Design a protein around this ligand. Structure first.
Ligand SMILES: Nc1ncnc2c1ncn2[C@@H]1O[C@H](COP(=O)(O)OP(=O)(O)OP(=O)(O)O)[C@@H](O)[C@H]1O
Ligand SMILES: Nc1ncnc2c1ncn2[C@@H]1O[C@H](COP(=O)(O)OP(=O)(O)O)[C@@H](O)[C@H]1O
Ligand SMILES: Nc1ncnc2c1ncn2[C@@H]1O[C@H](COP(=O)(O)OP(=O)(O)O)[C@@H](O)[C@H]1O
Lengths: 68, 66, 68, 308, 1223
């Protein structure tokens, strides 16, 4: 669209994606490493993943405040 | 006492009396800590209405001499 | 006979410019040569300026040389 | 939905131009500029202006007698007149020396040639927008359609803000080169005039009430000319297909000592380029109904100032 | 008196000390150096000062025969000595190279060449031994031919030896961060203690001194072994660290260096392993006092994490207070640490340690207050830099969200680590993640937001040693490869500050190098292959890469997309500013923390926005931290007064200096709105300096003291006291250089000497300023500024050098000094050379004003603003008056001035625009006009000064009218001149009234013989020759008046404010070279010569350098040039035409301006750099072409020196060509 959607152009690509995938696979593998039995497939508390995909992985490109 | 001789203020007396910095800034002048400035950053040779302070100190000193 | 073919950069124009103005190239002729070349010329000076066919000077020879 | 519209237009506007390329000055235009330069206003000599600003000034005629330096809005008046004159002199001089090379005589400059080319085209020369580092003044598109129009309007309001010397209602925020100084001067004015000391500068905080009214002093200011994007003033709703940029009503300000989530917070951008720079201030806009604020946040509302 | 001054100095100088230090007697000959030569050089310098001081004075008739010979010998001996000792150093590097058998065999040719130089060198040494006295030794003429050829050959020998240097570098990592010749010096130890004792700094992080104990082995000479290590800061304050495991010197330098590193690591590990038990055994105060700083901080962190853990499990078992008891224990620890160790303590290092603990503990308790996590698995606990010193496998391990790494055991002592805002936590988490995925963080943002220091702190906390460099456009990929090889080999971290300002193709190849290393590290492969480098090389894991690039300026390129892949971004736009302030105030130990923090923030914000916009203002974090590091001492003083008073005083008195005239009222009116409780405070005034200043101001002749000078010079003193370097921004003719000079004088008066050097940056090319690699012979050349740096920052000196740059501030050359002006204070080169700053040295800029500066250079250095009204032109006039009452003191000062004061004060401003005068072709500031008229009037009265005659008042009034008629009338056209004339008729002293038949006042002149206003041009025809040149020129009126004006100034003998330099202004074809050449023919070539030059656009400073050097042909400073002893003149037709740079600052006239202002310049002959030729006599004249419009203009700084006036058309051309037609 233009300035309505983003103040300036940013060049997101897959590097951030598989970075995030590597993180979360570590998180799930070492969560379930202690799980001897799954209630319904998991017992995750998915709020940390929010913070990570928000500010760390994709936070690199962002130069504006509002975009955060 | 005398306006001619006893009233003659030494540089120490002059400096302390100026250091009182009582009043007289009707136009609006800045700190007397280092220098007075008229309007925009312009040094003033002296406190604007210094003479009244001289008269007041002379009156007080005449009372002390009495 | 300089022409557009005889210029490849500006600098040539600078050297020629000063040649029109002064004619003394800095230390092209004064690389320990000005005195031998001037000494090869004073024989003409003996009659040309004609100082009563007696003597001459040293710097004045360079003056006459730039003149020529 | 209306976002779609603008995209397509610019897209179409370039596409044909591409193929439009594949197909197989020193004239009365300078006379047009020559006639122009006898239409922009005269300079304001500082020997007169310093006088005039010193002669009259106050926040409220009852509260204080006329005075210069002490009142923030008077020093702001002087600063703004200074920068305005700095630009006026440059424009008059370069128009002259652009026309005084052909009709006049001088060894032709490259800068002046660039100025000639810019005058023929829509874009003003770079001489009036930027400098080696940056000196942005009033960069607008047309040569005279808006640029000189905007500068003329700025000088008109500034003069009537000076020659009469009275504080008018309905200030035009776009005209001021440094809007933020306007607002902080308002803060200082409130701290001094009111609750002085009862209120400290660091204690005061900021707020705004939108004057929900067409037809109509106290503390605060009246701003004219803001523009919203994508809803109404109050009872904010979906915009129709046309009219993407809508007027903004009188958002009268308010300041209060500190402490003495239904609310949504908007930015205020000077130009529609929308960067970190040009963020003058932030405004809380409680008008929610059923739609929670995050709806608006993704919708990217904003209260810009110019319209281009 | 003077004959004594020559006699006793001769008696001493003929009988000098001759004590020399010999390397050794290990062969037939002995080679020696003078370790007293500093005394020689310095006492020589003031010797020649004394001798010139005498000679310049009038009463020194006899000495000329003697003194010159004496000076000549002294001057000559110096350079010979210098050349000699330099060659010695070269030889003193190359001797151990060719002692070894294999390398001498492997390259026989230059080994035998070195046998030849050894023969010749021994012959020189034995001749010197025979002489017994260094002065006849230098007087030998044969020597001088040999020395530089030997120098060149030894350069060739080094160019042979690089092939072995590469291998020797391979055998030990750290040498990659060292340049070639200093590496040679390091390798030519020739001694256990002495040689390396001055180089520990640039080979480890923080160590500077090590003891050496001789253990006497049986029959072997006693071997010196290291037993403890020391970090010295300041003079006496230091930190010592014992060692149980020892390190012994040996035969191979790499061996004992490696053992030093290892044994350091091992003892650090073991002391920590103990200290971790002692922390909980003894109790807080005992181990914090006992241990060193690094171990103490580790102990605090490990205690807190263990106890907090224990509390969290105890919560997990059941609802418990024990977590609260542990938090309360930390709270209790706070009071005991804060109460005692902060207020009173001994020593700087011990001081820095304490508040380093305090800041950590403040943040510690702040987290622990709100730390609502149920168990270890909770994210809120898994967000901080936790630590665990594992016992079962004895090893440290530091932990982040997931990442873990072991402490790297590097001794750093007490370092001033920094506060922890949440933004720093974002960086910590980001960088830990990136390093877990084997990349390199590349943070970005605007200037001064804590990028480089955040990187350095993550290095410091993890126990590793970081190596900042400074890329610049003059770089090449070979040196980057050297760096990266060192990084991979060692295990260290690199932080390439300003990585963007670098050539594009270099980045292209760097992309390859870094990708190779990334893939190598990814596999976890012990051994890998590096591009371009055939030998195989190993790796250690704990490495990392960082670039702190700076997005978007002038001279800034982009990273090609191959290279953006590797690095992960970190956006650092807005630093926090409140939390840092409040915790720093806590660290000092204040009590009104939270209020004051808000005060700081709001004041600096308001000042930034609503104050006037000037380029040089800065209110960023550098200024704030300067204020804080100031504010420590004031509380440390005994006063218990209320903090807010002290703080108002500190802030106000710090920020006054930069502000222009108008902003000061706004600034302190703004101050009043935040501290209404406080009314006023005096400025703390330093008594010694303020009493000292008037003393020397009176000591000079031409110096008037005024209060503004007191204010500005004291402000300069304060900013000198606080910060590294500073700038004197301010317009021309405002007294900057005088202020610097007088300050240096007062500092020198009370002991603590002070020396000042000058430089001009845009009169030499930056490649020459910092030196480059030669573009023909593939070999390095030295850089001027770096040579001055190396010559200045030696310890064991007494000066305090102030390197003065002086010119414009263009970003390209200045901006690669960021590291020196930042807290790193280390210089870095593309050579690979790194030089450490000392406190002996300061950097100053006497620049007019910034217009091409990014904030990255505005905020790095302090600044002081001079204003035009600080020193009015009137004060300068009074100084000249003081000079007139020096010798010609009969009545002249009083009489002359009795008109001057009112005739100048109440007149000059009624000419600028009172009457129209709207074509002042040369726009100026009127102080230049005042300097001009004074210089003219002195020449006017010179004749009656000569005959010792005193005149009446009326004649003097006429003279002043004449003087100032021109020199304010020289920049106007006939119409403006008649309006000027009418003004002078209306309200001034009499002008010619005898006839005045439609003739202006300019037409006539005052005669020395009598008070009359007449003028004429003498008749003179031609010689008999008929060449148009032989009809050279005729005696016009214009030419005669031009000679009249010129000759007055040109006779004046180098008075202050007189450069003896002139300049005409006239249209293209308005008799410029005509009148000038008419003057020039009248010279007497028997004692007065002449030289011609012309200007075009592409004439460069090197060209002007060449022509002036060819003109003089001698260095007349060192008592030379019999043929240049006659007086010479340099004539230039058009100073305008040289190409103005894009910024607006032309780069050719600056060489001229350093020639006029000071005489001389720096040499460029590929042999020596830091030195300048001197012109003791010259003269100067110029000619302009009506500047404005298409015609360029000269730099305004230069306008202060030249006499300027118009050259109108003649209006008489019927009468110029009359004669030639008559003949
Ligand atoms: N105390 C004083 N009394 C009288 N005259 C003074 C005094 N101090 C300086 N001057 C005069 O002021 C001038 C000093 O100019 P200065 O060389 O300092 O200019 P600047 O500030 O260095 O700028 P630039 O280097 O561009 O000239 C000289 O003419 C000097 O005679
Ligand atoms: N969080 C912080 N704590 C303490 N000092 C800081 C912090 N952030 C920045 N600074 C200060 O800023 C300066 C470092 O700025 P720097 O990172 O060199 O700027 P740039 O990143 O533009 O080179 C130092 O004086 C440093 O102490
Ligand atoms: N006094 C004179 N007698 C004879 N010819 C003169 C005299 N003055 C000037 N001229 C002529 O007028 C011309 C002026 O040229 P000139 O002044 O050299 O150009 P510019 O002003 O660009 O230096 C000269 O070439 C010279 O021949």
């Amino acid at each position: 669209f233009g300035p309505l959607g983003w103040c300036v152009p940013y060049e997101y690509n897959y590097s951030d994606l598989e970075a995030s995938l590597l993180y979360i696979e570590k998180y799930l593998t070492n969560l379930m490493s202690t799980p001897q039995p799954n209630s319904h497939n998991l017992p995750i508390s998915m709020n940390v993943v929010r913070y990570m995909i928000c500010e760390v992985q994709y936070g690199g490109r962002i130069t504006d405040d509002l975009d955060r | 006492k005398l306006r001619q001789r006893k009233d003659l203020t030494e540089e120490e007396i002059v400096d302390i009396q100026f250091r009182n910095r009582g009043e007289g800034l009707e136009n609006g002048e800045f700190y007397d800590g280092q220098f007075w400035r008229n309007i925009q950053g312009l040094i003033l040779p002296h406190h604007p209405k210094k003479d009244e302070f001289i008269e007041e100190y002379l009156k007080q000193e005449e009372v002390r001499i009495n | 006979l300089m022409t557009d073919s005889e210029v490849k950069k500006e600098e040539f124009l600078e050297y020629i410019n000063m040649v029109l103005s002064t004619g003394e190239i800095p230390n092209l002729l004064a690389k320990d040569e000005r005195e031998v070349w001037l000494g090869d010329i004073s024989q003409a000076y003996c009659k040309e300026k004609n100082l009563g066919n007696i003597d001459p000077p040293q710097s004045e020879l360079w003056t006459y040389f730039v003149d020529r | 939905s209306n976002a779609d519209l603008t995209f397509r237009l610019k897209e179409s506007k370039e596409m044909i131009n591409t193929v439009m390329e594949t197909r197989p000055r020193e004239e009365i235009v300078q006379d047009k500029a020559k006639d122009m330069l006898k239409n922009l206003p005269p300079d304001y000599n500082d020997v007169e202006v310093r006088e005039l600003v010193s002669k009259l000034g106050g926040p409220n005629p009852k509260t204080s007698t006329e005075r210069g330096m002490t009142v923030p809005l008077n020093i702001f008046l002087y600063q703004e007149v200074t920068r305005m004159q700095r630009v006026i002199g440059l424009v008059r001089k370069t128009l002259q020396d652009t026309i005084l090379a052909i009709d006049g005589q001088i060894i032709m400059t490259p800068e002046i040639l660039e100025a000639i080319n810019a005058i023929y085209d829509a874009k003003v020369p770079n001489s009036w927008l930027y400098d080696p580092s940056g000196a942005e003044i009033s960069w607008l598109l047309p040569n005279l359609g808006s640029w000189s129009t905007s500068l003329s309007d700025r000088n008109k309001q500034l003069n009537d803000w000076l020659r009469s010397g009275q504080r008018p209602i309905l200030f035009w925020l776009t005209g001021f080169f440094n809007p933020q100084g306007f607002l902080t001067g308002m803060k200082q004015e409130v701290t001094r005039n009111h609750k002085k000391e009862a209120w400290s500068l660091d204690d005061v905080v900021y707020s705004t009430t939108v004057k929900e009214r067409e037809k109509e002093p106290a503390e605060g200011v009246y701003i004219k000319g803001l523009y919203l994007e994508g809803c109404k003033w109050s009872k904010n709703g979906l915009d129709d297909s046309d009219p993407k940029k809508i007027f903004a009503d009188l958002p009268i300000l308010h300041v209060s000592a500190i402490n003495k989530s239904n609310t949504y917070l908007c930015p205020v951008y000077k130009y529609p380029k929308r960067t970190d720079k040009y963020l003058i201030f932030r405004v809380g806009l409680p008008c929610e109904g059923s739609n929670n604020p995050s709806h608006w946040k993704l919708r990217g509302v904003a209260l810009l100032c110019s319209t281009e | 008196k003077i004959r004594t001054g020559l006699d006793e100095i001769n008696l001493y100088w003929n009988d000098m000390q001759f004590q020399f230090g010999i390397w050794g007697k290990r062969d037939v000959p002995c080679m020696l150096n003078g370790l007293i030569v500093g005394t020689i050089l310095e006492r020589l310098e003031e010797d020649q000062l004394q001798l010139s001081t005498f000679n310049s004075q009038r009463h020194v008739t006899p000495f000329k025969a003697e003194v010159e010979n004496l000076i000549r010998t002294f001057s000559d001996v110096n350079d010979t000595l210098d050349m000699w000792v330099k060659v010695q150093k070269l030889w003193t590097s190359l001797e151990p190279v060719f002692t070894g058998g294999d390398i001498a065999r492997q390259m026989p040719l230059q080994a035998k060449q070195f046998q030849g130089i050894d023969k010749n060198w021994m012959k020189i040494m034995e001749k010197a031994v025979e002489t017994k006295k260094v002065i006849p030794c230098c007087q030998n003429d044969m020597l001088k031919d040999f020395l530089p050829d030997l120098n060149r050959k030894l350069e060739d020998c080094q160019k042979m030896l690089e092939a072995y240097l590469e291998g020797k570098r391979k055998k030990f990592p750290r040498f990659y961060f060292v340049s070639n010749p200093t590496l040679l010096k390091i390798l030519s130890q020739g001694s256990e203690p002495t040689s390396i004792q001055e180089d520990f700094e640039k080979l480890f992080d923080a160590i500077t001194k090590v003891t050496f104990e001789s253990a006497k082995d049986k029959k072997n000479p006693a071997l010196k072994q290291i037993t403890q290590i020391q970090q010295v800061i300041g003079r006496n304050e230091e930190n010592i660290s014992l060692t149980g495991y020892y390190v012994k010197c040996e035969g191979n330098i790499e061996d004992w260096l490696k053992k030093l590193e290892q044994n350091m690591q091992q003892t650090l590990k073991d002391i920590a392993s103990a200290a971790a038990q002692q922390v909980f055994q003894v109790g807080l105060k005992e181990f914090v006092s006992s241990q060193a700083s690094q171990i103490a901080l580790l102990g605090l962190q490990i205690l807190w994490t263990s106890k907090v853990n224990e509390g969290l499990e105890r919560l997990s078992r059941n609802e418990r207070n024990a977590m609260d008891i542990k938090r309360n224990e930390i709270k209790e620890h706070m009071n005991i640490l804060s109460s005692m160790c902060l207020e009173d303590l001994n020593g700087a290092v011990e001081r820095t340690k304490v508040e380093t603990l305090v800041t950590i503990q403040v943040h510690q308790k702040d987290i622990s207050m709100d730390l609502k996590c149920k168990d270890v698995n909770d994210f809120e606990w898994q967000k901080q830099t936790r630590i665990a010193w594992k016992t079962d496998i004895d090893e440290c391990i530091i932990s982040i969200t997931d990442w873990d790494s072991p402490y790297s055991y590097e001794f750093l002592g007490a370092k001033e680590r920094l506060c922890i805002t949440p933004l720093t936590d974002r960086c910590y988490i980001t960088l830990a993640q990136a390093m877990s995925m084997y990349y390199g963080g590349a943070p970005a943002g605007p200037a001064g937001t804590g990028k480089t220091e955040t990187v350095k702190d993550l290095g410091r906390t993890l126990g590793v040693f970081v190596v900042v460099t400074n890329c610049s456009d003059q770089h090449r990929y070979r040196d980057m490869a050297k760096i990266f090889k060192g990084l991979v080999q060692s295990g260290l971290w690199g932080c390439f500050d300003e990585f963007n300002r670098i050539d594009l193709e270099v980045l292209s190849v760097v992309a390859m190098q870094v990708e190779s290393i990334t893939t190598a590290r990814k596999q976890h492969m012990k051994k890998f292959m590096f591009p371009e480098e055939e030998i195989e090389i190993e790796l250690i894991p704990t490495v990392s890469y960082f670039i702190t690039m700076n997005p978007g300026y002038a001279g800034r390129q982009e990273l090609p997309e191959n290279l953006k892949v590797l690095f992960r971004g970190v956006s650092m736009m807005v630093p926090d500013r409140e939390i840092i302030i409040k915790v720093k105030l806590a660290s000092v130990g204040y009590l009104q923390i939270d209020l004051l923090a808000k005060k700081f923030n709001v004041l600096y914000r308001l000042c930034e926005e609503q104050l006037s916009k000037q380029r040089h203002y800065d209110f960023g974090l550098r200024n704030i931290l300067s204020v804080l590091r100031t504010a420590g001492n004031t509380k440390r003083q005994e006063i218990k007064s209320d903090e807010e008073m002290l703080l108002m005083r500190s802030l106000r008195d710090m920020n006054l200096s930069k502000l222009v005239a108008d902003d000061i009222p706004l600034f302190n009116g703004l101050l009043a709105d935040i501290f209404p409780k406080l009314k006023e405070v005096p400025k703390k005034l330093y008594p010694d300096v303020e009493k000292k200043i008037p003393e020397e101001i009176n000591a000079e002749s031409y110096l008037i003291n005024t209060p503004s000078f007191q204010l500005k010079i004291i402000q300069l003193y304060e900013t000198c006291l606080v910060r590294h370097g500073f700038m004197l921004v301010g317009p021309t003719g405002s007294g900057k250089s005088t202020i610097m000079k007088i300050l240096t004088e007062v500092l020198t008066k009370l002991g603590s000497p002070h020396k000042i050097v000058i430089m001009n940056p845009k009169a030499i090319t930056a490649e020459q300023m910092y030196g480059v690699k030669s573009e023909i012979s593939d070999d390095w050349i030295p850089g001027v500024f770096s040579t001055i740096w190396a010559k200045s920052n030696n310890r064991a000196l007494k000066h305090t050098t102030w390197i003065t740059c002086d010119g414009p501030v263009d970003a390209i050359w200045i901006e690669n000094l960021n590291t020196v002006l930042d807290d790193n204070k280390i210089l870095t080169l593309a050579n690979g050379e790194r030089i450490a700053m000392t406190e002996n040295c300061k950097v100053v800029f006497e620049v007019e004003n910034l217009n091409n500066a990014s904030p990255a250079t505005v905020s790095r250095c302090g600044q002081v603003y001079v204003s035009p009204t600080d020193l009015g032109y009137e004060a300068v006039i009074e100084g000249w008056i003081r000079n007139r009452k020096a010798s010609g003191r009969a009545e002249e000062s009083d009489k002359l001035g009795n008109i001057l004061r009112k005739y100048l004060i109440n007149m000059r401003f009624i000419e600028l625009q009172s009457k129209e005068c709207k074509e002042p072709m040369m726009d100026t500031s009127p102080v230049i006009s005042v300097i001009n008229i004074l210089n003219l009037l002195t020449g006017c009265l010179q004749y009656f000064v000569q005959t010792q005659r005193t005149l009446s008042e009326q004649e003097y009034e006429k003279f002043i009218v004449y003087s100032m008629a021109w020199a304010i009338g020289g920049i106007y056209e006939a119409q403006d001149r008649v309006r000027f004339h009418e003004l002078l008729l209306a309200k001034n002293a009499p002008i010619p009234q005898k006839g005045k038949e439609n003739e202006t006042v300019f037409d006539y002149y005052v005669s020395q013989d009598y008070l009359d206003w007449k003028i004429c041009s003498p008749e003179e025809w031609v010689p008999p020759q008929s060449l148009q040149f032989s009809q050279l020129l005729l005696p016009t009126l214009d030419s005669f008046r031009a000679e009249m004006l010129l000759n007055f100034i040109l006779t004046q003998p180098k008075s202050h404010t007189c450069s003896n330099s002139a300049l005409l202004i006239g249209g293209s074809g308005t008799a410029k070279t005509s009148s000038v050449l008419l003057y020039c023919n009248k010279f007497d070539p028997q004692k007065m010569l002449f030289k011609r030059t012309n200007f075009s656009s592409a004439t460069s400073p090197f060209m002007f350098q060449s022509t002036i050097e060819a003109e003089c042909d001698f260095k007349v400073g060192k008592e030379f040039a019999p043929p240049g002893n006659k007086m010479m003149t340099i004539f230039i037709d058009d100073m305008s035409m040289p190409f103005v740079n894009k910024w607006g600052d032309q780069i050719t006239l600056e060489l001229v301006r350093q020639l006029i202002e000071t005489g001389g310049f720096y040499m460029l002959d590929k042999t020596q750099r830091g030195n300048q030729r001197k012109m003791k006599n010259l003269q100067y004249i110029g000619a302009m072409n009506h500047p404005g419009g298409g015609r360029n203009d000269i730099p305004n700084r230069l306008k202060r020196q030249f006499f300027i006036f118009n050259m109108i058309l003649p209006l008489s051309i019927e009468g110029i060509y009359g004669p030639i037609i008559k003949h």
